[PDB]
Structures are given as structure tokens and as C-alpha cells.
């Protein structure tokens, strides 16, 4: 438009829009060397003419501290002057530093009456914070219809945190009957926008087809952008897709990599699959003892049940005396938690008498706890407990039908080799209690097996009537 020379001599002559400009000019520095005296002068001038953009701006200057020692008692009295005259940003702020106490005791009744009135000028941010205010019940009671409608409107206009929120809401339920792919439009959205949590929720929706085709690729893509921008979840989350190859081919050097930048913030998640690498190794990962048990170890003191499990077998097969009895620590803990394979290995341990004292009654309610979630080993173990009457009364009867269960089950050998051999104590009527006692166990106790029986099992045909 026109210089600073032009400029100045218009803010000389009164004019409140080029007082403003003209501190402007000082303030950002470029068509003048920065100079915030001069531009706090200016900024002062046009205020003094009850200016009200000027007024929002010295608001600014007291809030941040730019130019003037900071005072957020200040800054709320420049944007109750523009606020009250309508101007929709001085608004949002006064609403701001209510909410926060800053400047002023926190009231969040307050906020509220301010953000609304930015919200009702169709400010974005204005409309983001009524949303939050419904959706926490802070200075309004808790509605979460009202806050979906707040939270529409801002993200209709691209506000990316409410997007996150309608696609939370929908996912869940709340303030509306629950929709996924409704969940998943919300999502997309936000992951398109660029934003890290958009992007990990889409991205497993497309992982187990929640409110979307499954898409491993896709899902892929969506934990890669998200990944790269530090998601500890997203990082094992890719990492697991790259080791199980399930959008190309098998990568477990590389879901290394990403296990570990989970697993270095502390993630349990990115722990445990980082020590599983090294547990198990892979092509191109050889197995490593001490990383696998330092890793395991992080992830059980977090809590994971399958690194609990997984640490103390570690020890069992290769451990001493004291490892021993750490192990069965930590089968305790999973235990609790329904780990079937630590109740599995500690049923075995109390079989045993390994790195605990010995206890057959203890060790056949541990076996049933897991043989009842459908481990086959248990399933076996449950059976020789039956059979030689280990903290149990002998029972031929129910020894078989554990066999026939775990041979039904995934076709452990143990079990079809110790049925067979059960099988000839029986008489015809103990076989024929013991076959239905394993049709039992078999649909509540190995139901991925039962439903494969129903779908193949031979059936009767049906006489039609005729003539
Ligand atoms: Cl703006
Ligand atoms: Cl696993
Ligand atoms: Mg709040």
C-alpha cells in the first residue's frame, strides 16, 4: 500500500488503522530495524482512541510479555475492552485466561459466557472450546449432544483436535449411538490434516476393520506417518507389520528398529515385542539371552503378562536356583492377571517342586485355570494329574476325556498318545461317560476346535413324506 515514511505521516495525523500498522512495522522488523518501544508507542496511540483491535494487540504485548513486562492482570483488562465491543479473538482470549486463572481468579462459568460469544461469531477455536466445555461439563453441565454439535462446526472449519474428538465420540458412544465408520470419516479427516493420533486410530481401524475394510497396507501407511512422528504406538504397531510381513514382505530388521524406538520410551508394548525378537530371533535377528531378558524384564515390571510369562520360561530353561524362584514370581503375577501360560508353568512348578516349594493341590487348580482357557499342554498335564491322582483323586474318566481334549484341541501328540493308552482302563459304560465328559470340555474349553467338528461332522438325513 504505502511506505513507512507515508505511513508515519498518517499515524501522525490521527489515524488509528495506521498507528496500528505503523507499531506493526516496528514490531516485526522489515521495512525498519525491530524496535518494540517505538512499536509499543504506536500500538499505545491507536489504543488511546479506544481503537479495538489495537486494544486486543496491547492484550497480546501484557500476555506474552513482549515489549512490556509480562501481566496477565493487564492483559485481561485490554481484552475486556475489545471483548466488550465484540471483536471475536479479545473474546476467545478473556474466555482463555478465565478458564485459566490467568489474570484473574479462575471462573469457568466465565470462560464459558466468553468462548461462547467468540463460538456464536463462527470462530473455530471459539466453537473447539464450547465443544470441550460440554464434553468435560466445565462451566456447563456435561452434554455430550451439545458438545458433538460445537465440535462439527470447528471441524467443518478444519479444527483437527475436534475432528479427533467427534471420531472418539462415535467410537464410543457418546452423545450419540455408536457408529465406526462414522468414527473412522472423523479420523480420516484429522490423518489427513497431518495430525499423529488421527493418523494411529485410522491406521487401526484399517488393521482389524473397524468402521472400514481391513487394509493392512493402508493400515501401514497411516502407523508409518504416525510413527515418524515419535508414536511409541505406532512404532510397534508398524513394527509388528513389518516383522509378520503383512503388507510385504517379512522385514524383522527393520521391525527392530521400530520396536526399539517404542521400547526407548518407555512403551511396554514395543518392550515386549522387542525382547520376543530376541527370544525367538528371526532371519537376519539372532537370539540374544541378556537383551531379551533386560527387555522382558521392562515390560513385566509395566505389567505385560505375556513378558512376565515369557521372562520366567526363559529362566526355567536356562536359570539358576535364584532364577528359578524369580520365575515363579513372575508366573504368579501373570497368573493373577489370566495368563494361561504362566498358570500353565506355574501349575508345572508346583508339580515339580521347581523354584517353589511343592504342592500338588495348588498345582492342579493353577493347571485347571489354564486348561480351561483352551491350552492344550494344560489340557495334557490336567489329564496325568487325573490319571496318577496328583493333588486329586485318580480318575480314569476324567484323565481321558482331558487327552481327548487336548488331542481334539490343536492334535497334541501327548494327549492322542495318552487317550489311546487311557482308554483300555475303561470300561465300555466309564468310555461312554468319558466321551460325553470330552464333548463338554471340548465346546466350552477348546471352542475354536469344537466349531471346526460341528462344520465337518457327518449328519443324519431327514425322511420326507410321501404319496
Ligand atoms: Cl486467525
Ligand atoms: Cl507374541
Ligand atoms: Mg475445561
Not at 505511513?7 to 524496535?35: C, M, V
Not at 465420540?169 to 479420523?187: F, H, K, T
Not at 476324567?398 to 488331542?407: P, V
Amino acid at each position: 500500500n504505502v511506505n513507512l515514511e507515508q505511513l508515519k505521516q498518517k499515524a501522525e495525523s490521527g489515524e488509528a488503522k495506521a498507528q496500528l500498522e505503523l507499531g506493526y512495522r516496528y514490531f516485526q522488523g522489515n521495512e525498519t530495524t525491530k524496535d518494540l518501544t517505538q512499536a509499543m508507542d504506536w500500538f499505545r496511540r491507536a489504543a488511546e482512541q479506544g481503537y479495538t483491535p489495537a486494544e486486543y494487540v496491547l492484550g497480546l504485548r501484557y500476555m506474552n510479555g513482549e515489549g512490556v513486562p509480562q501481566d496477565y492482570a493487564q492483559a485481561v483488562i485490554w481484552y475486556k475492552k475489545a471483548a466488550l465491543k465484540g471483536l471475536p479473538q479479545a473474546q476467545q482470549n478473556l474466555g482463555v485466561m478465565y478458564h485459566e486463572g490467568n489474570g484473574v481468579k479462575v471462573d469457568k462459568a466465565e470462560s464459558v459466557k466468553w468462548f461462547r460469544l467468540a463460538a456464536e461469531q463462527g470462530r473455530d477455536s471459539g466453537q473447539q472450546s464450547m465443544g470441550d466445555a460440554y464434553f468435560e461439563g466445565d462451566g456447563v453441565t456435561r452434554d455430550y449432544v451439545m458438545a458433538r454439535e460445537w465440535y462439527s462446526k470447528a471441524a467443518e472449519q478444519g479444527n483437527v483436535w475436534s475432528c479427533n474428538q467427534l471420531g472418539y465420540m462415535y467410537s464410543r458412544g457418546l452423545g450419540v449411538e455408536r457408529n465406526d465408520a462414522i468414527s473412522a470419516q472423523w479420523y480420516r479427516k484429522s490423518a489427513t490434516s497431518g495430525d499423529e493420533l488421527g493418523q494411529l486410530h485410522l491406521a487401526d481401524m484399517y488393521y482389524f476393520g473397524i468402521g472400514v475394510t481391513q487394509d493392512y497396507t493402508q493400515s501401514r501407511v497411516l502407523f508409518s506417518q504416525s510413527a515418524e512422528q515419535g508414536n511409541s504406538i505406532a512404532q510397534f504397531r508398524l513394527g509388528y507389520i513389518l516383522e509378520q510381513g503383512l503388507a510385504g514382505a517379512k522385514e524383522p530388521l527393520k521391525a527392530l528398529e521400530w520396536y526399539r524406538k517404542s521400547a526407548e520410551q518407555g512403551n511396554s508394548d514395543g518392550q515386549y515385542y522387542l525382547a520376543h525378537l530376541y527370544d525367538k530371533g528371526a532371519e537376519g535377528v539372532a537370539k540374544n539371552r541378556e537383551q531379551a531378558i533386560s527387555w522382558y524384564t521392562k515390560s513385566a515390571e509395566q505389567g505385560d503378562a505375556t513378558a512376565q510369562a515369557n521372562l520366567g520360561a526363559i529362566y526355567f530353561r536356562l536359570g539358576s536356583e535364584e532364577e528359578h524362584k524369580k520365575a515363579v514370581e513372575w508366573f504368579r503375577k501373570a497368573a493373577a492377571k489370566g495368563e494361561k501360560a504362566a498358570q500353565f508353568n506355574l501349575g508345572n512348578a508346583l508339580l515339580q517342586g521347581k523354584g517353589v516349594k511343592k504342592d500338588e493341590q495348588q498345582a492342579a487348580i493353577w493347571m485347571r485355570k489354564a486348561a480351561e482357557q483352551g491350552l492344550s499342554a494344560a489340557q495334557v498335564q490336567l489329564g496325568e494329574i487325573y490319571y496318577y491322582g496328583l493333588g486329586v483323586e485318580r480318575d480314569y474318566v476324567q484323565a481321558w476325556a482331558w487327552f481327548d481334549t487336548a488331542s481334539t484341541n490343536d492334535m497334541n501328540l501327548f494327549g492322542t498318545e495318552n487317550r489311546n493308552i487311557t482308554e483300555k482302563k475303561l470300561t465300555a459304560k466309564q468310555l461312554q461317560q468319558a466321551e460325553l465328559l470330552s464333548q463338554q470340555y471340548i465346546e466350552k474349553y477348546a471352542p475354536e476346535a469344537w466349531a471346526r467338528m460341528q462344520k465337518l461332522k457327518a449328519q443324519s438325513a431327514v425322511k420326507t413324506g410321501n404319496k
